[PDB]
DNA sequence: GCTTTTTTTTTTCACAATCCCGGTGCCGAGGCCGCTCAATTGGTCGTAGACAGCTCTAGCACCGCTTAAACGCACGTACGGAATC
């Protein structure tokens, strides 16, 4: 009954955060913390992380509304 | 071995759709009536085909050559289908 709770971290996540935010969103910046909330501070996977958005419309995932050099808004269903 | 972490999976919860009930009423299944016309009865008359008795067609069995076709192997090319995009 105490505080770390969190993700389940990889593209079942970065489908499952990026809808569990209500509403559409920017950045790694966005993503990254929802992922790291438990207590697991970013270390290495930096590179992990930001990896995963040509692997995201490659596999087509999440289409991006608005981001340019590794910046990506990223929209599912509306 | 042991973390650092994919994927896989399981769990959970919310939503939508379909499933099952009783209530209601409307109408066509069902059955009855009376009359009709088509099935039955009891009659005759002729021929369709059953049957015996015959013929002799053609289906079957057999036999021995001469191939042409079937069989098996060696080899490798291009096609099927698996994986990724
Ligand atoms: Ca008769």
């Given at each position: 009954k105490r505080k770390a709770s969190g993700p389940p971290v990889s593209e079942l996540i970065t489908k499952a955060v990026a809808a569990s935010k209500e509403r559409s969103g920017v950045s790694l910046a966005a993503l990254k913390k929802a992922l790291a909330?438990?207590?697991?501070?970013?270390?290495?996977?930096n590179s992990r992380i930001k990896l995963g958005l040509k692997s995201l419309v490659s596999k087509g995932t999440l289409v991006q509304t608005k981001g340019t050099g590794a910046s990506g808004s990223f929209k599912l269903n509306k």
């Amino acid at each position: 009954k105490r505080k770390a709770s969190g993700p389940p971290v990889s593209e079942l996540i970065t489908k499952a955060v990026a809808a569990s935010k209500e509403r559409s969103g920017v950045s790694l910046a966005a993503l990254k913390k929802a992922l790291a909330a438990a207590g697991y501070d970013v270390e290495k996977n930096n590179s992990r992380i930001k990896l995963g958005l040509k692997s995201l419309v490659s596999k087509g995932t999440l289409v991006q509304t608005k981001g340019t050099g590794a910046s990506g808004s990223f929209k599912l269903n509306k």
